[PDB]
Amino acid sequence: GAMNWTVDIPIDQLPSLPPLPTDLRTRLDAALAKPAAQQPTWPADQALAMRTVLESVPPVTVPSEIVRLQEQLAQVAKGEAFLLQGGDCAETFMDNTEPHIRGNVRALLQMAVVLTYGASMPVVKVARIAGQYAKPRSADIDALGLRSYRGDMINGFAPDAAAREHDPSRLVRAYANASAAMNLVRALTSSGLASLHLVHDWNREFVRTSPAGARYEALATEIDRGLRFMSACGVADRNLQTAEIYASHEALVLDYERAMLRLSDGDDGEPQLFDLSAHTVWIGERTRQIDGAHIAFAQVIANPVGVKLGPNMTPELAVEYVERLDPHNKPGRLTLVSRMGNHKVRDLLPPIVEKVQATGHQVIWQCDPMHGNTHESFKTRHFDRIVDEVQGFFEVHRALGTHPGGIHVEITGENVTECLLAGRYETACDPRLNTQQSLELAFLVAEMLRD
Amino acid sequence: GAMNWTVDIPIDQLPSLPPLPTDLRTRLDAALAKPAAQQPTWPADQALAMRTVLESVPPVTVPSEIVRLQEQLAQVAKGEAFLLQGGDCAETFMDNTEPHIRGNVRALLQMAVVLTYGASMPVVKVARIAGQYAKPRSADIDALGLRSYRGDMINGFAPDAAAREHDPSRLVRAYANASAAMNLVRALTSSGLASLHLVHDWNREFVRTSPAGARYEALATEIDRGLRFMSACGVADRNLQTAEIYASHEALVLDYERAMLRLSDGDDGEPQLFDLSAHTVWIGERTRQIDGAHIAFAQVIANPVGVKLGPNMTPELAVEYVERLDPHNKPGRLTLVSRMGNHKVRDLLPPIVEKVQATGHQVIWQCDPMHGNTHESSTGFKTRHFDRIVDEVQGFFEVHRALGTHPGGIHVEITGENVTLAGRYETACDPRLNTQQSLELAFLVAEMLRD
Ligand SMILES: [Mn+2]
Ligand SMILES: [Mn+2]
């Protein structure tokens, strides 16, 4: 109650949920019985109580949006669209506010106009938002001797032991934060925030008040003339696609993902399991065990999925991911997310690309220039290394004649640090690019797209 | 806990955003110094703490949707559109589920297409949803000798004393539920659920399987032919609209409404206070004291508002509402909601309408045939006669026809489930018309609209 600073929710006399088709039950249980890395260590009975609450809430997303996303991603996979994915490294309940969310929505719309122009093709916009509340860790004890912070879905950022304990009630606070943020992203994307003219006036402000501004002025002016041309031709906002921003996060906490599963109706074909906590999810580098629960869970859901591929990836293993995760040969169903470091991508990526291409499957190739790039000191990342990874990624694909399909970026609408610091280091986890650096990267990637 | 079948969800105490401007807060404080009827009895310190939580959460609606609704309501006020408002008498946390929300959304869209055809003008769709969690009560002790149930925002439905205490942790729980429901209504209304052709196929199934189906066959077939005609003229899905369903509830719990106040960004007109817990709200019969806090709160917010007018209403008091609540003469800013009873509306409404018309202001005249037509059945249950409901609407139309004024809308309490007289009594409050009856009523009101 208010006196205890808690919301009390009775679980009993809640039930009556329709059973899954027998095969889906069997497969889902088989998937979840496999070993699972990076899971919270909280009690099974408390976890179950939280899942029962979540099994009956309104979903974050609906199946029809997910099949629409799959159709748009199929275009990307065929070389006819580009994927922009970006947002907070880790969302926090603390920053889950209208200014912060609007900041991320705007930054992503800004980047998308620039990339659409540079690419001369549609850009699919996927935010890391409305559920990016869990993060894997190498070590279970951090530099201070505390149990590691694993994101607000699991424990608290505060540096004391009680705050670090794994708290299954965070599954429910994660959901409430997620749907509040998704609700606002839907409102914002059908407001005037999404009109291209407005979005690009922001980019022109960036060009004035920026040290590298002169570098980007020509392209910003070219884009502005392209937009004014559109209107001169009689194209008004009403004659356009309303902005669609999709929600994604790493599918890490299987207690959360399984509780957000819903069965589709009879208007696809056969009923299918959709993870309705997001439109698309990805499986990270530490949870991608080929026979682990995460890959297997991914095989059971209908959502598009991604898999992060680090420097230790082989062509053979990459092909096994494709055959397990895209077994019906559905373009767009699978994204392979390269995160290799700028010093390694030119050498390690081509043989992987060649092998997968040879299978006849059409994956999206997406560059994650964040997580292969890092250095000692504050966790931080050089902008030039990030740019250079995306650059080498484009070189790999140009040489093979394959599609450089997208980028996956960690960013904020906030004027933060990390780009070389103590001034406003604000992240709950990894170094982002601030507003400015994100935008600068879009411009630079637009140039690689024109080339 | 484990012994209890209850889970306690901690409410995160998070950093506050900047406060609302001092001048608007000074105005609000003066308004809320007025006495307020029907308020929860929870302590001021708990109420304050809960409000503070809610001052920084993402809003449920945004200012631009509210100004859009205002524009569409101005059309209603001018006799060029029709207002449909409907949904649960009281939403509960327990029934705030995908199936129940989808069923109410469908019912409203179904009713809307029938009334649009009958009216030959646009219908504005306002759901009683995403916040209808508080009800007034005439006594504080119910028939079981317990403190009265006042809605899930205030206390619990369960017939036990602990549940009936007023706990302002329910403010936060209400917010999370409202957000999640609004999220789902946005998703549903840009899915194929919204498609006119799909919607009316439900209407045709209703005609096939209902008794007295043959009474509505002709209009249903007529409407079908109207849709096939527009499709034959090349009109496809995307030339129509996106379905817009707005959220409304009674502004009852001022701690909730005031915590949800936000300042607009000033990119439109100048910055002002909007209640972003909903698009529009109304003030009920028990809380409309001309000098009370509810009417004063309504003066300060930019949202469109309604006031329920019962049988004791005088033409002079009605004019006072117009002067307080539409001082600037903005058509459709105020809706006067007539709930007189079917035996009283023909006599009591005309002098109210005449006097208000004489002001020069353009209110929306909306008929609420529910809260004047309640009784209790011989077999215990609180009920309402369908025929009496129809006749009040009938009477409301006759008053407007005779005056040359616009019968502007209906306000109805309904569900998408097949509810009843002891078989399926499930409301938590007043007897909703079921799916079928609310639909049937739309057919009947369409015929009154054609006349
Ligand atoms: Mn990261
Ligand atoms: Mn009622």
PDB file of N, CA, C and O in Angstrom, chain A residues 1-3 5-12 49-50 56 58-60 62 64-65 93-94 96 169 173 175 180 182-184 186-187 191, chain B residues 5-15 46 49 58-60 62 64-65 96 167-169 173 175 179-180 182-184 186-187 191:
ATOM      1  N   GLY A   1       0.896  -1.197   0.000  1.00  0.00           N
ATOM      2  CA  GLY A   1       0.000   0.000   0.000  1.00  0.00           C
ATOM      3  C   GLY A   1       0.894   1.194   0.000  1.00  0.00           C
ATOM      4  O   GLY A   1       2.117   1.040   0.050  1.00  0.00           O
ATOM      5  N   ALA A   2       0.315   2.386  -0.052  1.00  0.00           N
ATOM      6  CA  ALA A   2       1.139   3.607  -0.066  1.00  0.00           C
ATOM      7  C   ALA A   2       2.120   3.706   1.113  1.00  0.00           C
ATOM      8  O   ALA A   2       3.263   4.150   0.935  1.00  0.00           O
ATOM      9  N   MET A   3       1.687   3.259   2.295  1.00  0.00           N
ATOM     10  CA  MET A   3       2.522   3.292   3.516  1.00  0.00           C
ATOM     11  C   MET A   3       3.835   2.513   3.342  1.00  0.00           C
ATOM     12  O   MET A   3       4.898   2.915   3.855  1.00  0.00           O
ATOM     13  N   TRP A   5       5.100   1.964   0.278  1.00  0.00           N
ATOM     14  CA  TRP A   5       5.522   2.319  -1.088  1.00  0.00           C
ATOM     15  C   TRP A   5       5.443   1.094  -2.028  1.00  0.00           C
ATOM     16  O   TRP A   5       6.402   0.777  -2.728  1.00  0.00           O
ATOM     17  N   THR A   6       4.323   0.382  -1.993  1.00  0.00           N
ATOM     18  CA  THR A   6       4.130  -0.761  -2.860  1.00  0.00           C
ATOM     19  C   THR A   6       2.715  -0.736  -3.423  1.00  0.00           C
ATOM     20  O   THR A   6       1.774  -0.201  -2.793  1.00  0.00           O
ATOM     21  N   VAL A   7       2.581  -1.315  -4.609  1.00  0.00           N
ATOM     22  CA  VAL A   7       1.290  -1.622  -5.182  1.00  0.00           C
ATOM     23  C   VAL A   7       1.023  -3.112  -4.910  1.00  0.00           C
ATOM     24  O   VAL A   7       1.858  -3.959  -5.218  1.00  0.00           O
ATOM     25  N   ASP A   8      -0.124  -3.433  -4.325  1.00  0.00           N
ATOM     26  CA  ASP A   8      -0.428  -4.826  -3.971  1.00  0.00           C
ATOM     27  C   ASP A   8      -1.336  -5.434  -5.015  1.00  0.00           C
ATOM     28  O   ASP A   8      -2.393  -4.885  -5.305  1.00  0.00           O
ATOM     29  N   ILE A   9      -0.918  -6.550  -5.599  1.00  0.00           N
ATOM     30  CA  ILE A   9      -1.699  -7.195  -6.648  1.00  0.00           C
ATOM     31  C   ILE A   9      -1.998  -8.634  -6.277  1.00  0.00           C
ATOM     32  O   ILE A   9      -1.088  -9.438  -6.117  1.00  0.00           O
ATOM     33  N   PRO A  10      -3.291  -8.958  -6.128  1.00  0.00           N
ATOM     34  CA  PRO A  10      -3.698 -10.331  -5.807  1.00  0.00           C
ATOM     35  C   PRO A  10      -3.626 -11.213  -7.058  1.00  0.00           C
ATOM     36  O   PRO A  10      -4.174 -10.831  -8.092  1.00  0.00           O
ATOM     37  N   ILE A  11      -2.911 -12.340  -6.961  1.00  0.00           N
ATOM     38  CA  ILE A  11      -2.700 -13.285  -8.066  1.00  0.00           C
ATOM     39  C   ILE A  11      -3.831 -14.296  -8.147  1.00  0.00           C
ATOM     40  O   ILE A  11      -4.217 -14.683  -9.241  1.00  0.00           O
ATOM     41  N   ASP A  12      -4.321 -14.763  -6.997  1.00  0.00           N
ATOM     42  CA  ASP A  12      -5.343 -15.821  -6.949  1.00  0.00           C
ATOM     43  C   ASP A  12      -6.643 -15.359  -7.597  1.00  0.00           C
ATOM     44  O   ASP A  12      -6.902 -14.153  -7.695  1.00  0.00           O
ATOM     45  N   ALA A  49       5.000 -16.113  -9.767  1.00  0.00           N
ATOM     46  CA  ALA A  49       3.939 -15.198  -9.375  1.00  0.00           C
ATOM     47  C   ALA A  49       3.933 -13.958 -10.316  1.00  0.00           C
ATOM     48  O   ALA A  49       2.882 -13.558 -10.807  1.00  0.00           O
ATOM     49  N   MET A  50       5.106 -13.397 -10.578  1.00  0.00           N
ATOM     50  CA  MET A  50       5.251 -12.217 -11.460  1.00  0.00           C
ATOM     51  C   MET A  50       4.820 -12.544 -12.898  1.00  0.00           C
ATOM     52  O   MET A  50       4.083 -11.775 -13.519  1.00  0.00           O
ATOM     53  N   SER A  56      -1.546 -11.753 -18.224  1.00  0.00           N
ATOM     54  CA  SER A  56      -2.861 -11.210 -18.524  1.00  0.00           C
ATOM     55  C   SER A  56      -2.858  -9.676 -18.736  1.00  0.00           C
ATOM     56  O   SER A  56      -3.912  -9.075 -18.897  1.00  0.00           O
ATOM     57  N   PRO A  58      -2.379  -6.078 -20.921  1.00  0.00           N
ATOM     58  CA  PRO A  58      -2.327  -5.683 -22.365  1.00  0.00           C
ATOM     59  C   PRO A  58      -0.902  -5.752 -22.944  1.00  0.00           C
ATOM     60  O   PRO A  58       0.071  -5.388 -22.281  1.00  0.00           O
ATOM     61  N   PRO A  59      -0.764  -6.268 -24.169  1.00  0.00           N
ATOM     62  CA  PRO A  59       0.600  -6.455 -24.689  1.00  0.00           C
ATOM     63  C   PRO A  59       1.276  -5.097 -25.041  1.00  0.00           C
ATOM     64  O   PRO A  59       0.588  -4.083 -25.205  1.00  0.00           O
ATOM     65  N   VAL A  60       2.600  -5.076 -25.144  1.00  0.00           N
ATOM     66  CA  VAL A  60       3.261  -3.858 -25.611  1.00  0.00           C
ATOM     67  C   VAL A  60       3.027  -3.620 -27.107  1.00  0.00           C
ATOM     68  O   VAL A  60       2.863  -2.447 -27.553  1.00  0.00           O
ATOM     69  N   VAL A  62       1.243  -5.681 -30.912  1.00  0.00           N
ATOM     70  CA  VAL A  62       0.248  -6.625 -31.435  1.00  0.00           C
ATOM     71  C   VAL A  62       0.809  -7.335 -32.678  1.00  0.00           C
ATOM     72  O   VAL A  62       1.702  -6.809 -33.361  1.00  0.00           O
ATOM     73  N   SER A  64      -0.166  -7.962 -35.773  1.00  0.00           N
ATOM     74  CA  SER A  64      -0.265  -7.302 -37.071  1.00  0.00           C
ATOM     75  C   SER A  64       0.886  -6.307 -37.289  1.00  0.00           C
ATOM     76  O   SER A  64       1.335  -6.143 -38.405  1.00  0.00           O
ATOM     77  N   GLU A  65       1.401  -5.674 -36.221  1.00  0.00           N
ATOM     78  CA  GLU A  65       2.547  -4.742 -36.350  1.00  0.00           C
ATOM     79  C   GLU A  65       3.834  -5.509 -36.609  1.00  0.00           C
ATOM     80  O   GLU A  65       4.763  -5.035 -37.274  1.00  0.00           O
ATOM     81  N   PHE A  93      14.392   3.148 -15.393  1.00  0.00           N
ATOM     82  CA  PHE A  93      13.079   3.616 -14.931  1.00  0.00           C
ATOM     83  C   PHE A  93      13.171   5.110 -14.645  1.00  0.00           C
ATOM     84  O   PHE A  93      12.224   5.853 -14.874  1.00  0.00           O
ATOM     85  N   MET A  94      14.328   5.522 -14.140  1.00  0.00           N
ATOM     86  CA  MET A  94      14.616   6.911 -13.796  1.00  0.00           C
ATOM     87  C   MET A  94      14.496   7.894 -14.963  1.00  0.00           C
ATOM     88  O   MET A  94      13.991   9.002 -14.798  1.00  0.00           O
ATOM     89  N   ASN A  96      12.784   7.243 -17.750  1.00  0.00           N
ATOM     90  CA  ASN A  96      11.638   6.867 -18.549  1.00  0.00           C
ATOM     91  C   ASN A  96      10.599   7.982 -18.483  1.00  0.00           C
ATOM     92  O   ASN A  96       9.496   7.804 -17.939  1.00  0.00           O
ATOM     93  N   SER A 169      10.022  -8.580  -8.659  1.00  0.00           N
ATOM     94  CA  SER A 169       9.016  -7.527  -8.867  1.00  0.00           C
ATOM     95  C   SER A 169       9.426  -6.552  -9.995  1.00  0.00           C
ATOM     96  O   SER A 169       8.585  -5.871 -10.543  1.00  0.00           O
ATOM     97  N   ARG A 173       7.463  -3.924 -12.885  1.00  0.00           N
ATOM     98  CA  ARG A 173       7.827  -2.521 -13.083  1.00  0.00           C
ATOM     99  C   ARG A 173       8.427  -2.288 -14.480  1.00  0.00           C
ATOM    100  O   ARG A 173       8.266  -1.203 -15.065  1.00  0.00           O
ATOM    101  N   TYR A 175       7.592  -4.035 -17.255  1.00  0.00           N
ATOM    102  CA  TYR A 175       6.428  -4.006 -18.111  1.00  0.00           C
ATOM    103  C   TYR A 175       5.662  -2.657 -18.033  1.00  0.00           C
ATOM    104  O   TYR A 175       5.255  -2.098 -19.066  1.00  0.00           O
ATOM    105  N   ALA A 180       4.206   2.247 -20.855  1.00  0.00           N
ATOM    106  CA  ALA A 180       4.034   3.713 -20.741  1.00  0.00           C
ATOM    107  C   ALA A 180       4.848   4.363 -21.829  1.00  0.00           C
ATOM    108  O   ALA A 180       4.394   5.306 -22.468  1.00  0.00           O
ATOM    109  N   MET A 182       5.931   2.891 -24.672  1.00  0.00           N
ATOM    110  CA  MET A 182       5.417   2.505 -25.996  1.00  0.00           C
ATOM    111  C   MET A 182       4.193   3.380 -26.321  1.00  0.00           C
ATOM    112  O   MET A 182       4.021   3.860 -27.457  1.00  0.00           O
ATOM    113  N   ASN A 183       3.319   3.538 -25.329  1.00  0.00           N
ATOM    114  CA  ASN A 183       2.166   4.433 -25.493  1.00  0.00           C
ATOM    115  C   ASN A 183       2.570   5.838 -25.966  1.00  0.00           C
ATOM    116  O   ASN A 183       1.994   6.367 -26.890  1.00  0.00           O
ATOM    117  N   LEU A 184       3.569   6.421 -25.321  1.00  0.00           N
ATOM    118  CA  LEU A 184       4.070   7.719 -25.716  1.00  0.00           C
ATOM    119  C   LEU A 184       4.762   7.631 -27.081  1.00  0.00           C
ATOM    120  O   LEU A 184       4.589   8.521 -27.897  1.00  0.00           O
ATOM    121  N   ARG A 186       3.958   5.798 -29.624  1.00  0.00           N
ATOM    122  CA  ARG A 186       2.828   5.803 -30.569  1.00  0.00           C
ATOM    123  C   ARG A 186       2.195   7.190 -30.728  1.00  0.00           C
ATOM    124  O   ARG A 186       1.911   7.614 -31.854  1.00  0.00           O
ATOM    125  N   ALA A 187       1.956   7.879 -29.616  1.00  0.00           N
ATOM    126  CA  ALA A 187       1.407   9.250 -29.655  1.00  0.00           C
ATOM    127  C   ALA A 187       2.333  10.206 -30.430  1.00  0.00           C
ATOM    128  O   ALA A 187       1.876  11.004 -31.230  1.00  0.00           O
ATOM    129  N   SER A 191       2.068  12.504 -34.127  1.00  0.00           N
ATOM    130  CA  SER A 191       1.950  13.948 -33.937  1.00  0.00           C
ATOM    131  C   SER A 191       2.798  14.690 -34.992  1.00  0.00           C
ATOM    132  O   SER A 191       3.353  14.089 -35.918  1.00  0.00           O
TER     133      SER A 191
ATOM    134  N   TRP B   5      -1.034 -15.032  -1.610  1.00  0.00           N
ATOM    135  CA  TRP B   5      -1.456 -14.908  -3.019  1.00  0.00           C
ATOM    136  C   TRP B   5      -1.528 -13.445  -3.496  1.00  0.00           C
ATOM    137  O   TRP B   5      -2.349 -13.069  -4.352  1.00  0.00           O
ATOM    138  N   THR B   6      -0.644 -12.634  -2.923  1.00  0.00           N
ATOM    139  CA  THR B   6      -0.497 -11.232  -3.271  1.00  0.00           C
ATOM    140  C   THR B   6       0.966 -10.988  -3.553  1.00  0.00           C
ATOM    141  O   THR B   6       1.853 -11.571  -2.912  1.00  0.00           O
ATOM    142  N   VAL B   7       1.221 -10.157  -4.552  1.00  0.00           N
ATOM    143  CA  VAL B   7       2.562  -9.653  -4.772  1.00  0.00           C
ATOM    144  C   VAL B   7       2.587  -8.142  -4.545  1.00  0.00           C
ATOM    145  O   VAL B   7       1.663  -7.411  -4.935  1.00  0.00           O
ATOM    146  N   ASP B   8       3.649  -7.690  -3.907  1.00  0.00           N
ATOM    147  CA  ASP B   8       3.870  -6.291  -3.619  1.00  0.00           C
ATOM    148  C   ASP B   8       4.854  -5.738  -4.635  1.00  0.00           C
ATOM    149  O   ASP B   8       5.996  -6.203  -4.703  1.00  0.00           O
ATOM    150  N   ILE B   9       4.418  -4.765  -5.425  1.00  0.00           N
ATOM    151  CA  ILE B   9       5.314  -4.169  -6.405  1.00  0.00           C
ATOM    152  C   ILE B   9       5.824  -2.860  -5.832  1.00  0.00           C
ATOM    153  O   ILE B   9       5.024  -1.971  -5.605  1.00  0.00           O
ATOM    154  N   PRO B  10       7.135  -2.759  -5.548  1.00  0.00           N
ATOM    155  CA  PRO B  10       7.707  -1.482  -5.091  1.00  0.00           C
ATOM    156  C   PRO B  10       7.436  -0.360  -6.072  1.00  0.00           C
ATOM    157  O   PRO B  10       7.455  -0.575  -7.296  1.00  0.00           O
ATOM    158  N   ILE B  11       7.148   0.812  -5.526  1.00  0.00           N
ATOM    159  CA  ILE B  11       6.997   2.003  -6.322  1.00  0.00           C
ATOM    160  C   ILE B  11       8.320   2.727  -6.232  1.00  0.00           C
ATOM    161  O   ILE B  11       8.723   3.183  -5.155  1.00  0.00           O
ATOM    162  N   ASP B  12       9.014   2.793  -7.363  1.00  0.00           N
ATOM    163  CA  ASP B  12      10.285   3.491  -7.445  1.00  0.00           C
ATOM    164  C   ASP B  12      10.114   4.999  -7.133  1.00  0.00           C
ATOM    165  O   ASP B  12       9.243   5.694  -7.671  1.00  0.00           O
ATOM    166  N   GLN B  13      10.958   5.479  -6.237  1.00  0.00           N
ATOM    167  CA  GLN B  13      11.025   6.898  -5.893  1.00  0.00           C
ATOM    168  C   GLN B  13      12.077   7.513  -6.801  1.00  0.00           C
ATOM    169  O   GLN B  13      13.274   7.309  -6.616  1.00  0.00           O
ATOM    170  N   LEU B  14      11.622   8.243  -7.803  1.00  0.00           N
ATOM    171  CA  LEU B  14      12.534   8.704  -8.833  1.00  0.00           C
ATOM    172  C   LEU B  14      12.673  10.226  -8.816  1.00  0.00           C
ATOM    173  O   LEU B  14      11.787  10.917  -8.317  1.00  0.00           O
ATOM    174  N   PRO B  15      13.798  10.744  -9.342  1.00  0.00           N
ATOM    175  CA  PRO B  15      13.998  12.189  -9.439  1.00  0.00           C
ATOM    176  C   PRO B  15      12.850  12.868 -10.151  1.00  0.00           C
ATOM    177  O   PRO B  15      12.348  12.368 -11.170  1.00  0.00           O
ATOM    178  N   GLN B  46       0.311  10.692   2.247  1.00  0.00           N
ATOM    179  CA  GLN B  46       0.331   9.580   1.303  1.00  0.00           C
ATOM    180  C   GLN B  46      -0.109  10.045  -0.086  1.00  0.00           C
ATOM    181  O   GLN B  46       0.563   9.764  -1.076  1.00  0.00           O
ATOM    182  N   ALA B  49       2.697  12.019  -1.670  1.00  0.00           N
ATOM    183  CA  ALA B  49       3.762  11.147  -2.158  1.00  0.00           C
ATOM    184  C   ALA B  49       3.385  10.445  -3.485  1.00  0.00           C
ATOM    185  O   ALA B  49       4.184  10.423  -4.397  1.00  0.00           O
ATOM    186  N   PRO B  58       5.438   9.288 -18.135  1.00  0.00           N
ATOM    187  CA  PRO B  58       4.973   9.645 -19.470  1.00  0.00           C
ATOM    188  C   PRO B  58       3.455   9.810 -19.492  1.00  0.00           C
ATOM    189  O   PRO B  58       2.735   9.072 -18.842  1.00  0.00           O
ATOM    190  N   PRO B  59       2.959  10.795 -20.256  1.00  0.00           N
ATOM    191  CA  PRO B  59       1.547  11.134 -20.130  1.00  0.00           C
ATOM    192  C   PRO B  59       0.745  10.012 -20.834  1.00  0.00           C
ATOM    193  O   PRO B  59       1.345   9.217 -21.569  1.00  0.00           O
ATOM    194  N   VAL B  60      -0.573   9.944 -20.612  1.00  0.00           N
ATOM    195  CA  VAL B  60      -1.419   8.983 -21.319  1.00  0.00           C
ATOM    196  C   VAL B  60      -1.811   9.483 -22.733  1.00  0.00           C
ATOM    197  O   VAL B  60      -1.925   8.690 -23.699  1.00  0.00           O
ATOM    198  N   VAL B  62      -1.395  13.245 -25.469  1.00  0.00           N
ATOM    199  CA  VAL B  62      -0.544  14.414 -25.714  1.00  0.00           C
ATOM    200  C   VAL B  62      -1.368  15.604 -26.198  1.00  0.00           C
ATOM    201  O   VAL B  62      -2.459  15.426 -26.764  1.00  0.00           O
ATOM    202  N   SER B  64      -1.369  17.772 -28.635  1.00  0.00           N
ATOM    203  CA  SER B  64      -1.843  17.831 -30.024  1.00  0.00           C
ATOM    204  C   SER B  64      -3.063  16.943 -30.332  1.00  0.00           C
ATOM    205  O   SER B  64      -3.905  17.298 -31.164  1.00  0.00           O
ATOM    206  N   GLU B  65      -3.183  15.783 -29.676  1.00  0.00           N
ATOM    207  CA  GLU B  65      -4.394  14.972 -29.828  1.00  0.00           C
ATOM    208  C   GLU B  65      -5.590  15.698 -29.216  1.00  0.00           C
ATOM    209  O   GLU B  65      -6.716  15.611 -29.698  1.00  0.00           O
ATOM    210  N   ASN B  96      -8.905  -5.354 -17.315  1.00  0.00           N
ATOM    211  CA  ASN B  96      -8.126  -4.507 -18.194  1.00  0.00           C
ATOM    212  C   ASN B  96      -7.214  -5.435 -18.956  1.00  0.00           C
ATOM    213  O   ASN B  96      -6.022  -5.491 -18.698  1.00  0.00           O
ATOM    214  N   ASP B 167      -6.588   3.437  -0.490  1.00  0.00           N
ATOM    215  CA  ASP B 167      -5.129   3.418  -0.567  1.00  0.00           C
ATOM    216  C   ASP B 167      -4.593   4.095  -1.852  1.00  0.00           C
ATOM    217  O   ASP B 167      -4.825   3.587  -2.947  1.00  0.00           O
ATOM    218  N   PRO B 168      -3.863   5.223  -1.713  1.00  0.00           N
ATOM    219  CA  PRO B 168      -3.471   6.007  -2.887  1.00  0.00           C
ATOM    220  C   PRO B 168      -2.343   5.360  -3.700  1.00  0.00           C
ATOM    221  O   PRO B 168      -1.963   5.899  -4.740  1.00  0.00           O
ATOM    222  N   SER B 169      -1.857   4.187  -3.269  1.00  0.00           N
ATOM    223  CA  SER B 169      -1.021   3.362  -4.153  1.00  0.00           C
ATOM    224  C   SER B 169      -1.865   2.963  -5.378  1.00  0.00           C
ATOM    225  O   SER B 169      -1.339   2.678  -6.447  1.00  0.00           O
ATOM    226  N   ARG B 173      -1.273   2.405  -9.605  1.00  0.00           N
ATOM    227  CA  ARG B 173      -1.789   1.239 -10.270  1.00  0.00           C
ATOM    228  C   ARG B 173      -2.770   1.651 -11.368  1.00  0.00           C
ATOM    229  O   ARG B 173      -2.756   1.046 -12.439  1.00  0.00           O
ATOM    230  N   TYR B 175      -2.786   4.548 -13.038  1.00  0.00           N
ATOM    231  CA  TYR B 175      -1.952   5.129 -14.083  1.00  0.00           C
ATOM    232  C   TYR B 175      -1.362   4.028 -15.028  1.00  0.00           C
ATOM    233  O   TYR B 175      -1.460   4.136 -16.265  1.00  0.00           O
ATOM    234  N   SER B 179      -2.334   3.711 -18.969  1.00  0.00           N
ATOM    235  CA  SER B 179      -1.260   3.689 -19.950  1.00  0.00           C
ATOM    236  C   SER B 179      -1.219   2.455 -20.821  1.00  0.00           C
ATOM    237  O   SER B 179      -1.037   2.558 -22.033  1.00  0.00           O
ATOM    238  N   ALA B 180      -1.332   1.288 -20.199  1.00  0.00           N
ATOM    239  CA  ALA B 180      -1.284   0.011 -20.933  1.00  0.00           C
ATOM    240  C   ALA B 180      -2.527  -0.142 -21.820  1.00  0.00           C
ATOM    241  O   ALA B 180      -2.448  -0.671 -22.930  1.00  0.00           O
ATOM    242  N   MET B 182      -4.392   2.449 -23.047  1.00  0.00           N
ATOM    243  CA  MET B 182      -4.256   3.439 -24.105  1.00  0.00           C
ATOM    244  C   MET B 182      -3.252   2.977 -25.183  1.00  0.00           C
ATOM    245  O   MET B 182      -3.481   3.201 -26.383  1.00  0.00           O
ATOM    246  N   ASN B 183      -2.136   2.400 -24.750  1.00  0.00           N
ATOM    247  CA  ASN B 183      -1.200   1.776 -25.664  1.00  0.00           C
ATOM    248  C   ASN B 183      -1.893   0.766 -26.610  1.00  0.00           C
ATOM    249  O   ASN B 183      -1.714   0.813 -27.814  1.00  0.00           O
ATOM    250  N   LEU B 184      -2.696  -0.127 -26.049  1.00  0.00           N
ATOM    251  CA  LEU B 184      -3.419  -1.093 -26.824  1.00  0.00           C
ATOM    252  C   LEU B 184      -4.461  -0.425 -27.721  1.00  0.00           C
ATOM    253  O   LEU B 184      -4.561  -0.796 -28.877  1.00  0.00           O
ATOM    254  N   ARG B 186      -4.335   2.554 -29.138  1.00  0.00           N
ATOM    255  CA  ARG B 186      -3.581   3.074 -30.276  1.00  0.00           C
ATOM    256  C   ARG B 186      -3.187   1.970 -31.281  1.00  0.00           C
ATOM    257  O   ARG B 186      -3.409   2.141 -32.479  1.00  0.00           O
ATOM    258  N   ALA B 187      -2.631   0.858 -30.793  1.00  0.00           N
ATOM    259  CA  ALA B 187      -2.265  -0.292 -31.634  1.00  0.00           C
ATOM    260  C   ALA B 187      -3.474  -0.841 -32.381  1.00  0.00           C
ATOM    261  O   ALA B 187      -3.404  -1.049 -33.579  1.00  0.00           O
ATOM    262  N   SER B 191      -4.550  -0.962 -36.605  1.00  0.00           N
ATOM    263  CA  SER B 191      -4.529  -2.305 -37.183  1.00  0.00           C
ATOM    264  C   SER B 191      -5.722  -2.475 -38.147  1.00  0.00           C
ATOM    265  O   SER B 191      -6.494  -1.546 -38.361  1.00  0.00           O
TER     266      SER B 191
END
